[PDB]
């Protein structure tokens, strides 16, 4: 029996922006990084994930007609409290929110699921307000 | 076409002439740079999309050329009794049976002319614009009212 | 006007798809149809 299992992993920072990238097809990769899943210590119960800084958000391309068409949704607990917002407008404001939402949904839903999400740092930009290393990934 | 000048850029094509310049925005399914003592356009793959664009692009460019060597044109006949028009600065105060006359400020690179008091014409380098503006005027009081009153192109009514 | 069977009503009338929808336009406006 081997408990190959690691001792506190020295986490990685990464800068990433294919500004003209399909969201999702980006977001999918982001997530993989967020769980230490490229790395061969993958440890499911732990968060030995990376830190991922998306710069130059907005810009994200997307296929077919998904402005006025993709519709983001918020139910405030009230009567009549569904809100529907086209993607146009999300870009038009809170563009940094578009990429985030897409990534979130692809991470696991528990408490760790939540904790990894906070290891993702998204900026419509560029310029990323933390110089703390950043092996840029392409 | 003579005193007029066609350069080429990526998705753009610039047409200078005696009356002004215009940019025609054009599809990259084409390889058109200043060509001959005239100007031609072709298209790749005989597909749906291309076939359509070809000929469109032809025309857009054509109407851009006529523009710059004078292509003003376009004229409106106002009909009915009390109705008439009147130039004011470069604006138009046509009075057409509403209780208060309708003033029409001119957009950029366009000139109204009030030859008569019941004829009006729109000057312009463009054509898209001209044609629009004339519409906006017509709309002020479209015609048809079991006949006669209102404002008309040179196109004509049906009993 | 708004019917699930739009057809040509006359030879001046004309069938036109615009913006997802099948219309018809004649010279005379009684002939104007839109599919729905």
């Amino acid at each position: 029996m081997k408990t190959y299992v690691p001792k506190q992993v020295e986490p990685r920072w990464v800068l990433i922006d294919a500004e003209g990238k399909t969201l999702g097809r980006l977001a999918t990769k982001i997530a993989t990084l967020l769980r230490g899943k490229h790395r061969p210590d993958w440890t499911p119960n732990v968060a030995m994930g990376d830190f991922v800084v998306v710069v130059n958000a907005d810009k994200i391309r997307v296929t077919g007609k998904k402005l006025e068409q993709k519709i983001y949704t918020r139910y405030s607990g009230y009567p009549g409290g569904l809100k529907k917002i086209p993607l146009e407008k999300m870009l038009a404001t809170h563009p940094e929110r578009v990429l985030e939402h897409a990534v979130k949904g692809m991470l696991p839903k528990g408490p760790l699921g939540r904790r990894l999400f906070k290891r993702l740092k998204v900026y419509a930009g560029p310029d990323h307000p933390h110089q703390a290393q950043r092996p840029e990934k392409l | 076409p003579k005193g007029v000048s066609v350069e080429v850029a990526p998705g753009r094509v610039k047409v200078k002439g005696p009356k002004g310049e215009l940019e025609v925005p054009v599809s990259p399914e084409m390889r058109v740079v200043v060509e001959e003592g005239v100007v031609r356009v072709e298209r790749p793959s005989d597909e749906r999309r291309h076939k359509s664009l070809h000929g469109l692009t032809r025309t857009l460019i054509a109407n851009a050329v006529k523009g710059v060597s004078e292509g003003y044109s376009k004229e409106l006949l106002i009909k009915g009794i009390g109705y008439r028009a009147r130039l004011v600065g470069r604006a138009l105060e046509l009075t057409v049976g509403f209780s208060h006359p309708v003033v029409v400020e001119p957009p950029e690179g366009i000139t109204f002319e009030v030859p008569e008091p019941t004829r009006v014409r729109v000057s312009g380098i463009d054509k898209q614009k001209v044609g629009q503006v004339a519409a906006n005027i017509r709309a002020i009081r479209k015609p048809s009212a079991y006949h006669e009153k209102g404002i008309y192109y040179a196109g004509e009514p049906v009993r | 006007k708004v019917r699930a069977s739009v057809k040509r009503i006359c030879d001046k009338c004309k069938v036109i798809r615009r913006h997802g929808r099948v219309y018809v336009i004649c010279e005379n406006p009684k002939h104007k149809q839109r599919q729905g």
Binding site: S76, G77, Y78, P79, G81 | - | -
Partner: protein, 204 residues
């Protein structure tokens, strides 16, 4: 956006042209601007004014002499007045002219644990015919198995009043500079002696 801290003093009516016009008097003592927010450092722009002068130097942590007229900072504290940036040494009532229109904000009277049918005007039960412990009660509050719950926001009984209220577009009827006084079209939130703020209106 003009505006000044002030105190509701109470109301009467005067006569205009030849008609009785009810007014509430406001005392808008001059208001020492004690900080200015800029967009540069604070993000947004406004002016923090002060009001009720007197104070036995109870200034402890907010010594904040910092701005000229730190003149022992006001009892009734100090508030901002959003987009507003004037003659940086006090705000009088000369600010306003008669005729002008203003929005007034203050504190509605504290009604305590209100019934429904006061908090909300509900219909209440019949004074007779029908049984007898449901006269001021609210009736039903739902359906049944679907949705099997009460909705958020249901008008119900509780703490009512003692809350901010902005009544809008009041006529300024007269301004007494001499006394820092101010007359308007009567009926402004809150009780007499009570704090209010007084801004140019929104019909433009």
């Amino acid at each position: 956006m003009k505006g000044i801290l002030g105190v509701k003093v109470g109301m009467t009516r005067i006569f205009r042209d030849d008609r009785a016009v009810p007014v509430t008097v406001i005392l808008a003592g001059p208001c020492p601007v004690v900080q200015r927010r800029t967009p540069e450092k604070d993000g947004y722009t406004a002016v923090q004014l002060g009001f009720l002068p007197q104070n036995p130097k109870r200034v402890n942590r907010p010594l904040k002499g910092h701005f000229a007229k730190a003149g022992v900072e006001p009892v009734r504290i100090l508030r901002e007045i959003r987009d507003f940036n004037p003659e940086g040494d006090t705000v009088t009532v000369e600010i306003f002219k008669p005729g002008e229109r203003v929005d007034v904000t203050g504190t509605s009277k504290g009604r305590g644990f209100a019934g429904v049918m006061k908090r909300w005007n509900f219909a209440g039960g019949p004074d007779s015919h029908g049984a007898h412990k449901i006269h001021r009660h609210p009736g039903s509050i739902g359906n049944r198995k679907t949705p099997g719950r009460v909705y958020k926001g249901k008008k119900m009984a509780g703490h009512y009043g003692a809350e901010r209220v902005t009544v809008m577009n009041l006529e300024v009827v007269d301004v007494i500079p001499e006394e820092n006084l101010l007359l308007v079209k009567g009926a402004v939130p809150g009780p007499n002696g009570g704090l209010v703020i007084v801004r140019e209106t929104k019909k433009a």
